[PDB]
Structure formats: C-alpha cells, structure tokens
Amino acid sequence: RIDTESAHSARIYDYIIGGKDYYPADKEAGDAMSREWPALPVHMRANRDWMNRAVAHLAKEAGIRQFLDIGTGIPTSPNLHEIAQSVAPESRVVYVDNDPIVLTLSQGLLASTPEGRTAYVEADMLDPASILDAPELRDTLDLTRPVALTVIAIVHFVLDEDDAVGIVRRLLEPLPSGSYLAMSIGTAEFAPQEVGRVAREYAARNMPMRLRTHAEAEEFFEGLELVEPGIVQVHKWHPDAATADGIRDEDIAMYGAVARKP
C-alpha cells in the first residue's frame, strides 16, 4: 500500500522537519527543493509551530474541546490532540489523511487521555461524506457542539477543478455556530522565483500545487469572523518572543488564519 518508490507530500515534509518517516524518493525530492529554495526547512518548521499556536489559542482562549483535522500528515510531537488535551483532558480529536503511511503510524494519534477521545479515519477530502458520516467520527465528535476544523498544510494540493473553497465550506456546513476554521495556505507572493521553482518540482513528481494570493485566501473565510490579525504570514500570527527570530518574509510561503462561524 505504501508506494515507497515515489515521493509523497507528507513524507517530504517529515524528512525536511527532521523526522524519520520517509523513503529515498522523499529525500531526493526534499533535497532538490531545498537547492531551489534554501528556506524550505524554515518554512516547514514555521508551519508546524503555527499549528501549535493556533490549536493552543483555540483550546485556551476560544474554549474549543472538539477538533476535526483534515490532512493530518506524519505524527509529530506534540500532536494536535496532545496540545488540546493538555489544556482540557476531555478534548476530542478526529484525524484524517489519505496517505497509507499515516494509518501505519496511527497508534500515536489514538493514544488519548482517558477523559478524552481520539480517532483516525483514512479518507479523501474530495468526498466530504466519507469523513462526516465515518463511524469513527460520529462516535468521537458531537456535531451539535462547537468543533474546530483544521485544514493545515494541505489545501495547495487541491487544484481548482475540484473547488477547494467548496470542499472546505462543505466540511464546515454541519458544524454549529461557534465552530472555527483554521488554515495554512501556500503562496508564492513573497518569493516568486524560488517558491515557483519548488512548486514545479512538486508538479514534476505528480503533486501539482495551487499557490494562492491573499485575495484568493480570503475566499475561504467569507461569511466567517476572522480572529485578529486576520490572514497573515504564519510567523506573524500571534508570534512568541522567538517566533520570527532570523526569519525574513521571503523565507515563509504560508498564510495562516483562524475564524469563527456565526
């Protein structure tokens, strides 16, 4: 099932951020991409750090106790549920990915506090019903209470013919008032040549990307209430004292944003 001879996006990301869950094809891809854009590891680490700050905000400040994470990727410490459950042990998280390697690594995702619950669903976001009607999900989350929908480091792999904005908003539909949408969205605006070349290395390896402008990112959040500072480069979203240390704008190719559903 794993297909170790071709590169996969989750495995390249893990290779670059220092994990072990990758194969030679993933290393070759990551190394080629870093040659085009030396900041690639700074970008990928900053996206992970952003997830950590966004989930902590959602759990602590917003009081959210249920999360639906679309495109979970390779488990990496701390995982989303470990952050949420440290704030409130009763928190519940459903993780979702379509890369078969994630299923093989799913024990760490399933290691919940006793007060809380977690589950893992192998599914494709192109079929929202397969996610929303999954028994693992319906046994885990109560969709009559607020949920944070997290769609992090995935949407740029959905090209326009499948309507990424529509898919995301279809997943948000069943979540009640007071739910949230949190996303990171890939952009070429801050380093067009280097990021463009990286995107073309992904396309050459059968992972075409759709990078977006700020205006295009805004489409996902129409009708929702953005948390300040709005849609900004990830290292500028609620930074800690060290968040942007030595990081230039050109070194970051993700927008991040969190918004409340009225």
TrEMBL record:
Record protein name field: Methyltransferase
Short name of one Pfam family: Methyltransf_19
Species this chain originates from: Streptomyces avermitilis (strain ATCC 31267 / DSM 46492 / JCM 5070 / NBRC 14893 / NCIMB 12804 / NRRL 8165 / MA-4680)
InterPro entries with a match to the protein in the record: SAM-dependent_MTases_sf, SAM_dep_MeTrfase_SAV2177_type
Binding-site positions, S-adenosyl-L-homocysteine: Y13, N47, R48, D97, D124, M125
